[PDB]
Each structure stands twice: as structure tokens, then as C-alpha cells.
């Protein structure tokens, strides 16, 4: 199917920086874009970032445009997201998602795996 | 004849961002290449005629250069007023040919669509035909998928869609779909549904109504 | 109004280095202890006889430019030297100067041009300028010194040699101001500029005995016919 | 020369150059250039000589017209497009752009004046497009008996010979009266050696002697110095200062 | 200055010929060369031919030689073009341009444009539009606002001008492009945004005008619950 995984994370200090990793193998990586999501404890989902085939610039939401930077590597199927100036609100679980719409500018929301992130 | 290729097909960058475009020709040239600005449905506006040669009234914003088979054009920054398509021209010979054209549009964040539905009216039904119209308004992506779920079942090949242009006020976009059916077919079903899926929405949005309401 | 030009107006005559020698030079020099007109802002067209000596001891750089040409505002070629915030602008374009050249962007209308040049800006501080036009060359000598004319002796070094062969008989100076009306036929409208004074002197053919120190700097001179 | 933006001889372009250096070793003399001619002076003398100012005019003409670009010449181009006096002194740089500036059946853009009411004055330019008086009285923007139009198109193409190809020609005129020399053609042409008797030149100041490093302190505006009795003691290097 | 004046839109049956004009004014007519261009509804521009009235000669493109003739007359300073054996696809925007790039050291490029003429080829007949109102449902209201308007159907030929309240209302105006039905007739659509407090009660009116015949049609709209 769309088996996906992420690595890294965990406890971090407030106001610092963090790095998260996500990758896939054994399936096409171009026809579907790679997106992220956020979910606070017992709350609704929130989109974080997504990367397109061309890689022209980057895509972000309102609350993450000016703080987070995202990138993807087409030669290794690995993607990264940048964490900086961490605030107390960043105590939730992130998810790595695949835009399951073939060659589509938009996105189909579907998450494969996630991890926990918290600030001391 | 001479054929030219313009790539990439479209550009996306926010106000105050650099943008560039390239034009290619079948054979190497060193002059007689122009660039045009054409708004939707309006006559093209001259930008460049001779290699790195601007005419009267062109601002310092736009510059061009290139040699050989390929030529390049650059836009230092963008404002809403210059949102339109750019074209490449070669006229070293009388058989003029024009490039495929490239579009530049404003880049911004996500805006959730406002999904609306129009049920048919009695007067329309009296003509022997029925229609249902679904609208998406004020959302970022330039194309949105609209699915019809009459009687909770997907339908295809029986509806038409309309497309608008980028909204200069907020750089948003709108899309609408129109379902059409005959009186017998319209009365055959009982429930009409329109489904919308967007990246910004937390989950798919569905609007539906029944025959009796 | 007139003041005293004690020992000012001396400049290097021939760009030749000399060390610890006394050189007798014959050229256009400002006579010692000569009377020079005293003008203060708070500005008429003056003649351009064989030599002119310009000095200014006004802070804030109110004085900003000069105009030179025969039949000013006519078809004849004329100069336009102004000091912008970035670089100096020298134009030979027969500019059509108005009665009130500039007190506030441009003091003249469009006209044909023959030469243009730009360089770094020339500008309680004393500014001295000597302008000579001979054999088709317009030579400028300048010097700067913090600061009536001070008793201090100082020799003006050459600044630029414009290879322009136009004919010159008159000149006028340009002043800077703010919050003022751009009236071509009126002056002092609106806000008034700060206090500033500038002196004008005329050179004459004189013999001088310049004293060159070990470093090639003129330290003293004697007015031979005083 | 590289611009080649003078396809039409009629209504040719003009340019003024002053306070510059015109190194002819690279201009009109390298392999890419095909032809180059001068009137009244040899290229070497031009390179070694200085001029007050240079006016440059560029135009593209056929092979049959290049011969008309010379003093006291006559012809369609000479009479109606670009006339020159018998005493004219200058140079013409002509390069054939047929390979890179011709089409199989194109090149209609190269226009020239085929007729005119009267011959142009020396160095005169005319952009008028009025009908030529072809036998009958000239038409006033109308058609008449003949009323032929003066301009015509070269229409260069491979089917034409070398004598009917788009020769890109640039003509320069030199001025020497009242010359405070500002345009010159010499290259760097510099060589230095010290500690031995040699004839030397520093922007003139011809002399002979041994050149050695000096401990003097020349001012920024001083070029050379003189000892007692006006003897040239030290000189500033134009290049190294 | 220099300007060009073109005629109005003309419609003629397929297979016949269509006449167009483009008048020139300013300066001297002998100093202007008129070039003709065409633009289809979305496809790139197309070049038909070029004439120089002072020359007396003309040239035409290979794809359009024979079927296209160009004539111009100095007395009334107007340029004309002739098209023969028209076809349905000939429906396109037609422009007149002045090929001024022949006198002042400037070559093979246009600088001046006309107003543009619209021509359509079809077997239909000229008639006024049909307008009916929309009846949006109350349950469909989203964000405190509702969508409403009128539809202009079964009209021929273009152009068609659609406005609202005799032009007195301009906030939240949207008018989507025209479409062609399979029966050979054009159509148009327009929708507005209105607050909850005004819909149903305000005297909202949709305005339509058919300029080929200057037909005037207007209707009122009201939602339902
Ligand atoms: C400069 O022109 C004036 C007339 O405007 C004339 O009297 C004077 O002689 C000229 N200068 C020279 C050096 O001839
Ligand atoms: C000459 O210059 C040297 C080096 O700057 C300095 O030491 C010396 O005092 C100067 N002498 C005079 C007379 O200016
Ligand atoms: C001349 O050029 C040489 C080499 O670029 C450089 O070393 C030298 O300083 C230059 N001198 C001047 C006066 O420009």
C-alpha cells in the first residue's frame, strides 16, 4: 500500500531547533506529493507543510509559514522539516502524509505514521 | 516553418519574488526576438522587440537577454497588476510563429472554499429538464474536484464545470459544477449530493438535499 | 562689502615636484592683501576676467554649485557644476538658465550636450576654489580646512582638468535650500536657508616666489610686486 | 559590430564617440571580419594617430552598393541614401552576414531608397517617404501615371550571389580640427627595466638614464619632479604609480 | 499622435465573403503600412497579410494566399480586407495594426493597434436573449451570505452586456465567460454575494442588454425557504 514511517523527535528544549525525517520505498514517489499534519492531544488535525515535484519554493499553513521550512529529496525518497524557535504550543504528534491524488496540485489527506514531539 | 518551445508552462510566486522564463528556437539566432504581455481576452502589450531592447514606456522591471538557439527573460518582482500570460515571438522571417505562452500567478497561503448548492426551480422543471449546480468559492488551488453523489452513488459524464480567473482582490480562485438531467431521470432519484475535497479542509465537505426538500 | 585677502589664493602652478628650493613662478595669482567682495545669503552674476578666486566658510554646505558661460541662458554652451548627495555633476549643454537659477531640482531646461562627467563630491569649515580657463583647458584647484578669511597659509591643489575649449566671460553661483518655492523669477520664497557666506576674488598676472619644503608642499610665498 | 541592428541602410543609425580608445587590432582586423578599407590614410597610421572625436554610422547594403561607400562616389545608395564628399576621410568596416542574416526566401526587411527627387547632401540623412516623381509630376500620397515609390527591398536569399548579400557596413568619420586629443588607438605598449642605462618615455618626457627606486614622497597630483636647475630627477610610473 | 479606428462586429452566413475596415488618422497616411492580425477565442494570434497603400503592392501568408485580399484607399484613409469561403472556425477576434517599422530605422514590428472586430460564422439567426431567475434555498446559506443571479440563454450573436441594478450595484460582482450550446446558441451566467440581512427583502434586479439589436431585458430575483 502506502506504508510510511518517520524517525527522530522526542523531548527538546524550548526556543531551540529540531529535525524530523520521513521516507518511503518500494512505490512511486513523483505522482503523489508528500505532506505533513499536526494533531494536538484530543483535538482536530492541522496541516503543516507539503512538497511538490518541481520543488519551486515551499508550501505552508498560516501558523507555520514564517517559522518552519520543508524540503524533499527525490533521489532518496526522504523528506525533512525544520523546527526552530520552539514555543510551548508545540506539544503534539506530527504525521507524515501522502497526497494520494495522481498528478494533482491539491492533496488527498492521508497519514501513514507519526511521532510525538514535546518541549521541556 | 520555425517552431519554438516555452518552458515551464506556468510560474507561481508571491508578490516581491523573482520570476524568469526562457524561449527556444528551432535554429540558432542572435536577434529578431520579441516578448509579449497578453491579459485574458485583451490585445498583447509590447514588452521587448529586439534583443535586450525595450520600447518607449517599458519600466526598468523587465529585462531580457540571450543568444543562440535559446533566449531568456526575467522579471525582478511581481505585483497584482501584471498577472497575465507571457509569449515569445520570432520574426526574422515572414512566417511569424508565436510561443505556447506561460502564465504567472500570485502565490499565497490556503483559503478554505465556500461550498454552495442550487436546487432546481419549478419553472425550470416545467421545460422537461432539470439541473443541479454546485459552487466552490474563494479557495487557493486553481482546480478543485467536484463529485456528484446522487442517491449516495457517484456519477460521471452528466455534469459540466465552469472556471474563473484569479481574484486580484485576494488572489483566490472559484469553481462551479452544473449537473443536468431530464424530468424522468430527475424524478427517478430521491437524494442529490455534492462532495468537495480540499487540502485546507480538515475533512471532505458534502452538501446534499432530497427531492422533497 | 569688501574684505582682506591676506595671503590666500596660492596654488601649485605646474604639477612639478620640487624639494627644498625657491621657485619663481609667473602666472595668474591672487594679489596679497587684495580686496575681495563679501556676499552673504541672509547673489549676482559676476564677470569672469582672466582669473577668479572663490571661497566659502559656511557650514551645512549651503553653497552647492556654480554656473559658467557666455550669454547665459542663450544658445551658447555653458557649464553646470552641482554637488549632489552622491556625486558631482558637470554638464556642458548650453543650459537655459533662468533669472533665479536654483534655490530648493534642475536650474535649466533641456538642451544639446557636448560633454558630461561625474566624480566624488567636492564638499565652521573653509572651502577655497580657483578657476582658470586657458588654452582650451578649464582647471580647478581646491582645498579644505576647518574654520573673515583665516590668516592660515595654505596652497590649493589641482582637482580636475576638463578638456573643454568653450569661451567664458561670466559666472554665477548656486545655493541650496529646503521648503522653498521653485520660482525661476523669484528668490527667498518660503523657508529661508541657514547663514552662509562666500567670497569672490580676481587673479592678475603676477610674479611669485614659492617656497617648497622637503615633502613638495608649498609652505610660504612672497607677492613680488607688493 | 556585434549588434548588427542596422539591417536597413535607408534611415541609417548615427553615433558619436569621444574620450575613448579605439584599438583597431581587435576592430575590423580579426578573423571574423571579412573586409576593411580606409580613405586618405593607412590603417597603421590611423592606429598610431589620435583624433578629436569619431562619428560612427552603420548600415547593411548589397555587394553592388559597397563600392559606392567612398569619397566622390555615385549610385543609388550614394545619391539617395548615403552621399559622401570627395574630400571625405574615414574607414568602412564591412562584414557579410548572409550565413547568419539570410533566409531561404526571406530578408525582405533590408530596405533602401531606389529613387529620389534630388541627390542627398554630404553626410545628409532623409527619412521622408514621399512618392518619387517617376516621369510624371509627383503624387501627393496618391497613385498616378507612374508615381513610383522611392524605397525598395533587397530580399536577400541563397539564390543570390555574393554580390547581392547582406553586407553589414559601418563607416567612421574622423575629426582633427581643434584637437585636444581624446580618442587614440594605441595598445598598452609598455615595458620596464631598471638598473641600466636606457632610453625612456613617460607620457613624453623623452630622456636617457638609469631608473632606480626613489625614496621621495610625491604628492598624488604630481607626475614628475625636477631637481635644482630644472633637472628631471624622478618620474612616476603611469601604470604602477 | 497616431490612432486607428475599426468597424463594428459583423456576422454573415458560411461560404460567402465578409467585409472589414480600419481607418487611419494622424500624420501623413502615406507614412503608415497596415498589417492585419486575427485572434481566436483562446488560441494564439494569427497573421493574415500586410499591405502598404503607398506602395500599391501587397503580400499574403502561405496558409492564407488566394482566399484573402487586402485593399486600402488613400482618399478616406481606410484599409480593408476581403475573406472568401468562410468556415465556422473563422469565428475569431480580428485586429488591424500599422506596420510602421519601415521608415525610421525600425524593421518588421508593429506599434499601433485598432479596436478589434468580432466576426462569427454560423447558420443561426439573430434573436434576443431569454432570461430566467435563480431560486437559491435558505438551507444552502454559508458564512452568512448566499449566491444569486440570473442566466442569459438562447441569444445570438455577440457581444452581450450583463449588468445589475442599472449599474447602481457593483460590490461582489461575478460574470463567468460565455459558452456555446450543442444547438448552436450562446449562453451566459452571473452570480452575486449578498448578506443574510438583505436577501429576500432588498429590491435586487438583474440587468441584461443585447447590443446587436439593442434589446433590453431585466428581471427580479428572490430566494426561497
Ligand atoms: C567670448 O565671447 C565674447 C562675446 O560674448 C567676446 O567678446 C570675447 O572676445 C570671446 N572670447 C574670446 C577669447 O574671444
Ligand atoms: C615629510 O613627511 C614625512 C613622512 O610623512 C614626515 O615625517 C615629515 O615630518 C614631513 N616633513 C615636513 C616638513 O612636512
Ligand atoms: C594597472 O593595471 C595593473 C594590472 O591590472 C595594476 O597592477 C596596476 O595597479 C594598474 N595601475 C593603474 C594606475 O591603474
Residue numbers in the entry:
A (entry chain Z): 10 to 129
B (entry chain Y): 1 to 213
C (entry chain B): 27 to 68, 81 to 142, 158 to 176, 187 to 210, 215 to 293
D (entry chain A): 342 to 582
E (entry chain X): 1 to 225
Provide the authors' own sentences about this structure as they appear in the paper.
A broad-spectrum therapeutic antibody, JMB2002, which has completed a Phase 1 clinical trial, maintains neutralizing activity against Omicron. To stabilize the constant regions of Fab, we used a nanobody that binds to the interface between the variable and constant regions of the light chain. The diverse configuration and stoichiometry ratio of the spike trimer bound to the antibody further highlight the conformation flexibility of the Omicron spike RBD. The up-down RBD-RBD interactions within the spike trimer are conserved in these complexes. In addition, our structures of antibody-bound Omicron spiker trimer uncover a distinct mode of antibody binding to the spike trimer, in which the unusual RBD-RBD configuration is preserved. In addition, the binding site of the JMB2002 Fab on the RBD is distinct from the epitopes for previously defined class I to class IV antibodies, thus JMB2002 represents a new class of antibody against the spike trimer.
